[PDB]
Design a protein around this ligand. Sequence first.
Ligand SMILES: NC(=O)c1ccc[n+]([C@@H]2O[C@H](COP(=O)([O-])OP(=O)(O)OC[C@H]3O[C@@H](n4cnc5c(N)ncnc54)[C@H](O)[C@@H]3O)[C@@H](O)[C@H]2O)c1
Ligand SMILES: NC(=O)c1ccc[n+]([C@@H]2O[C@H](COP(=O)([O-])OP(=O)(O)OC[C@H]3O[C@@H](n4cnc5c(N)ncnc54)[C@H](O)[C@@H]3O)[C@@H](O)[C@H]2O)c1
Ligand SMILES: O=c1ccn([C@@H]2O[C@H](COP(=O)(O)OP(=O)(O)O)[C@@H](O)[C@H]2O)c(=O)[nH]1
Ligand SMILES: O=c1ccn([C@@H]2O[C@H](COP(=O)(O)OP(=O)(O)O)[C@@H](O)[C@H]2O)c(=O)[nH]1
Ligand SMILES: [Cl-]
Ligand SMILES: [Cl-]
Ligand SMILES: [Mg+2]
Ligand SMILES: [Mg+2]
Ligand SMILES: [Mg+2]
Lengths: 310, 311
Amino acid sequence: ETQRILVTGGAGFIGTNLVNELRNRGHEVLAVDLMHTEREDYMRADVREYRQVERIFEEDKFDYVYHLAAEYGRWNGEDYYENLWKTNVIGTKHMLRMQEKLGFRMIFFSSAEVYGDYSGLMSEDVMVKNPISDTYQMNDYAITKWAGELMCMNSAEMFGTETVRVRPVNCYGPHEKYSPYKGFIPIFIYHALHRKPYTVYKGHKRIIDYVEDSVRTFANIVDNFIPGEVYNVGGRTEWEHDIKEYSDMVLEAVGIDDSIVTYRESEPFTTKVKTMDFSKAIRDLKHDPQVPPEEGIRRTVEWMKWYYRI
Amino acid sequence: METQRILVTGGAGFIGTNLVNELRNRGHEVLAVDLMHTEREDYMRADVREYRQVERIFEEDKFDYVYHLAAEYGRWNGEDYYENLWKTNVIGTKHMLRMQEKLGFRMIFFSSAEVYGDYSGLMSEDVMVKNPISDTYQMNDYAITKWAGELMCMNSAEMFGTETVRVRPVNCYGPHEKYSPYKGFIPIFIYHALHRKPYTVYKGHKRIIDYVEDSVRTFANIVDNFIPGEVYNVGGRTEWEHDIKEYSDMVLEAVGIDDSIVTYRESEPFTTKVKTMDFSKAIRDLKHDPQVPPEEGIRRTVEWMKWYYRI
Ligand SMILES: NC(=O)c1ccc[n+]([C@@H]2O[C@H](COP(=O)([O-])OP(=O)(O)OC[C@H]3O[C@@H](n4cnc5c(N)ncnc54)[C@H](O)[C@@H]3O)[C@@H](O)[C@H]2O)c1
Ligand SMILES: NC(=O)c1ccc[n+]([C@@H]2O[C@H](COP(=O)([O-])OP(=O)(O)OC[C@H]3O[C@@H](n4cnc5c(N)ncnc54)[C@H](O)[C@@H]3O)[C@@H](O)[C@H]2O)c1
Ligand SMILES: O=c1ccn([C@@H]2O[C@H](COP(=O)(O)OP(=O)(O)O)[C@@H](O)[C@H]2O)c(=O)[nH]1
Ligand SMILES: O=c1ccn([C@@H]2O[C@H](COP(=O)(O)OP(=O)(O)O)[C@@H](O)[C@H]2O)c(=O)[nH]1
Ligand SMILES: [Cl-]
Ligand SMILES: [Cl-]
Ligand SMILES: [Mg+2]
Ligand SMILES: [Mg+2]
Ligand SMILES: [Mg+2]
């Protein structure tokens, strides 16, 4: 059965892909984001502004709301913290107030940054059973996402609202624009393509997830929505690589050596190891990513080369 | 006996007014900062949400110590006024952290014992370190703002070497706390009892209440033994724990009426059941030695409210 779905942050990277995927499945989808655009089934709403949020829900009825509207990224959160807190937290509270009033089901976008610098396997239950000091969030961005999770749980507890939280991991792929405030993959690709120098912080491990894969699993939440649940959504546990390995994949795909690269040991204040357990998404959400990092990076290099015309 | 130059944000508030007065009485030079204009000397209006206004405070004076109390106080207040809550408690605190990172004053950050959530065991400070995270999930936005603030203080300390002591005040009450329906239980009980107006007692809860003059003495002692990176519960004594009816009965006894005006309920939903505080750390570092137990403190507060509202 097809649903009426709101996607806030629907003009962003995951949001755009998710909107298209949901529409591809036959759902009716309103995309909402912070700017005006040309596109149909689109509405500008600053989620910081209660009146604008209420306006969304006055115009349309929704079965499901994917809430992605956010100031994304740890460095962004430090440099633009006012926008960060107002959007990520007050916006989420406005959305929860709407949810309490209207009873839609919500998919809340948190972040695997909620796990802080935890160096064990990032299973969802780390944010339940582990000593609280394991996951002290390392930047404001990460704290907003954890605050959002707490607010979702308090709302469910107080009003019986129905919410699934997701913790996206290190999503990358075609249609993600470059900026210096994006994740490492688009930074590496854009710099490599332009033969421009960039830094690799060696002492870190990540699992990158291809947008098409992650979006398929996000879209699957509608088909198996379990109120109160939380899911890591990302690649595969065994797709862990260190940062040099990812850089080398980018350089290989561009076809250049690492002469443009400055290597540093570690990025301060940055999660060392971010190795995720996806068994829960595998169980409930038919999580089955098809695009491993080598292949994904190639596709992303190809998209960036074409899109920025290198 | 060393004079400090001290800023107190939230300095026209309940704890803030008492703290400013106590610090001044000790010989410190204290600027009070708050959200409204007042008649007071050594006072400046600054909305801590507004970076420019925060920056103005630090253009005017250099401070050795900053007590950061400016906040939207209270769990119900946080739910009904959440925009102000998040902007002030969190963005305001981040502006203060940015100033601290630039200027290097020492800060006392005011958190809340609500950060312990509904934990049923002894609320030692390290419950926020060693206990499973689910033991202390914060139960309302206000509690989340305080926990977010503590995390931000720790991150600033890690990243910039800023020097901050966090305090978790508990259930502070006393003279100079005005009534509103958004205050804690003690001034609600007192004001309603004084007016012979009905009020509700949620029975299935225990609290340790702390008399403002005692708590401010300990908060003031921090500038005398400031250990960067520390966190302290500051409240009464573990032995002064009572259930809510017991506190209600103290209020009624002090007003001189019976409990005919009281509506009893078994428990308040989404409210911490038991808040058994461990004050060993404050006793150890801060000469914490509260002198006013609840019975006496309630009497003093009843008397103060009686005169101030001319009942
Ligand atoms: N990309 C990842 O790897 C990753 C990792 C962890 C968490 N997340 C979270 O997933 C979501 C999507 O990530 P993304 O990579 O697509 O980020 P993105 O920045 O591309 O998407 C976020 C969108 O939200 C919009 N937005 C910001 N403030 C808004 C406001 N006040 N009102 C309305 N819209 C507003 C932005 O304009 C943007 O289009 C975000 O919530 C992000 O924090 C992503
Ligand atoms: N039992 C307690 O009283 C208790 C318990 C736990 C935590 N706390 C915390 O201790 C502090 C003092 O509590 P209180 O009982 O005196 O509360 P209060 O409300 O009397 O004091 C807070 C003060 O902050 C001011 N303020 C609010 N927003 C501001 C802004 N944007 N800019 C500047 N000033 C602003 C208010 O005007 C007020 O005077 C608060 O941070 C509170 O959250 C108190
Ligand atoms: O220019 C850059 C940006 C990031 N990184 C590293 O890439 C990893 C992922 O960083 P990002 O901010 O993309 O994601 P997160 O840290 O949230 O997983 C971290 O180890 C960073 O140190 C890097 O080496 N160079
Ligand atoms: O009108 C009221 C307000 C509060 N309380 C109780 O008093 C205690 C203290 O609540 P408050 O909000 O003052 O503080 P906190 O919950 O943060 O300790 C709780 O058990 C409440 O249920 C009560 O019985 N009646
Ligand atoms: Cl993230
Ligand atoms: Cl409090
Ligand atoms: Mg438009
Ligand atoms: Mg003035
Ligand atoms: Mg504003």
